[PDB]
Structure formats: structure tokens, C-alpha cells
Amino acid sequence: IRTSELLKRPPVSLPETATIREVATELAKNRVGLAVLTARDNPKRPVAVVSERDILRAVAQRLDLDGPAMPIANSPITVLDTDPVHVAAEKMRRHNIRHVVVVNKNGELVGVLSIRDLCFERAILLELAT
Amino acid sequence: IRTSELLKRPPVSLPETATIREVATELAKNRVGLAVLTARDNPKRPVAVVSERDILRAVAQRLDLDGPAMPIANSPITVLDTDPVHVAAEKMRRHNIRHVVVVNKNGELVGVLSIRDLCFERAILLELATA
């Protein structure tokens, strides 16, 4: 199974100019945990990622949640749409993260894969198990 | 493999009167995503849960983050410390959640199990796949 085969929905993405609350709004609405911030010059080019974890920490620290999201963002960890799903599972495990950003050969955003997408189906489980 | 075998640290718990930001602070500190709210008269008894996802929604809705957490809380979805890990995975899948509250036979809080705990190690995946 390739990572593209498991991608059924578009990822949550926002311009790199997004506020913290704007990211939270899109994540809450789409019931997913990681948002991709995209370049001003290309909305399909990933620049950073913001997790619900980052927003949580912003709340803990009393940051202005209408301020910019980029300062709480981190560099994306990526796999290819062409990569076998075991590579996606390896990066989540080894980087201790619950998502990977799926990009194509040309570096454009294809989707985001969750550990939730890999762990529940028997066929994916058995593939990752062996 | 039992759920108790995969518990890492003591669970994040706060009394049921906790504010939203108090929950966020404790979760941020412990680097985990689910807090258990416990009964005022019994700190061992879970009454509700608040995850980073609930806090996310709170932010999106512009709630007073220094107001009570209970209104944004959910009923605890629990498993026993003696349950096989496939029971936890199934509860996560069927309730569309990424955590479960682990309790003992007397209903006391033992820990919180995450999807991270179940979904990385092969031996565990294998056991989830067999069920």
C-alpha cells in the first residue's frame, strides 16, 4: 500500500499568515489534529505545520491567540505519495509524531496522514505488523 | 498484552472545578493530550475528560479559557487495566477518539492510554490485527 492510497480527503492548510485561532477553527471543523501552513507564493507548497498540541501550549502560555501561528509552527516531516505506508509509520514512530505530511516528487502538498489512518484497518495493520 | 502494560506515566487529573487553562497547563507540562476530571469528593473517580481537541474547539469558539472546563468536557470512555489492548483500540475506533481512560475493577483511575501507545510497536500491531 502506498501513502496516496490511504489519502481520501484534502489536508487542512492555511496561508503562512494565518493566526493561531484561524488554524484552530479549521482543525476543529475538520476534526483533524495537524494543519499545514503554505507559502505566500504557492498555496500547495508546505512551509510549516501546526498541531493542536502547539495550540494547547499557546493556551497554557497565555499567548494572544489572534496573533500569528507561524511562531508556534514547526518544520514539516514528510513522506512521498509514492512511498509505501510502512515508511509513514516509521517516521511517526521515530520522530514521535502522530502525523506525516504527504508530498509529491515536486514538493507540493498532497495530504496529511494520521496514525489513526494506519492503525485500525486489519490490512494496513498486518502490512505494518510484518 | 494488557492495557496496564503500556501505561507510561501517572495520568493528568484535575478536580472537576478546574478551568480550561488549568487543564491546558497540566497537559502542556506532562506532554500528553488527555486530562481526567475527577469527583470533588473522590480524586480517584473519573467524571469527565478534556482533551487538547476540546481545548482546540474552545479556542475556535472564543470561549473564556479561564472559565470552567467541565462544560467542554466529555463522558469518560474507559477500559480495564486488565483488558487486552484490542479492547482499547476498538473503543478508540468505535468512539472516534484517540485516548481511553484506564480504570481498575473498583472504577479507580489507573492511567490514560493513547493511540501512540498502541500503534507503533509491531508486536502490539500484530495483536491488534489478530483480534
How would you class B124 by CB atoms within 10 Å of its CB: exposed for 0-12, middle for 13-18, buried for 19 or more?
buried
Task: Count Cα atoms within 13 angstroms, Cβ side, for B19.
Answer: 10
Q: Which residue from B minimizes the CA distance to A19?
A: B60
B80 within 8 A of B7, measured Cβ to Cβ:
no
Domain range for residue A74?
1-130
* B117 annotated to a ligand binding site: yes
What is the distance in angstroms between the Cα of A82 and the nearest Cα belonging to chain B?
A: 21
Contacts with A90 (C-beta within 8 Å, 6 or more apart), sequence order: none
Resolution in A: 2.1
Query: What's the domain count of chain B?
Result: 1
Listed residue (A116, A94, A108) closest to A41, CA to CA = A108
* Helix-helix angle B85-95:B122-130, to 10 degrees: 70
Partners of residue B92 in chain A, C-beta under 8 Å: 120
Cell numbers found for residue A70: 507561524
Nearest to A91 by CA among A11, A23, A3: A3
DSSP state, B11? -
Calculate how close chain A gets to B91, using CA atoms only, in Å: 11
The CATH number of the domain holding residue B31 is 3.10.580.10
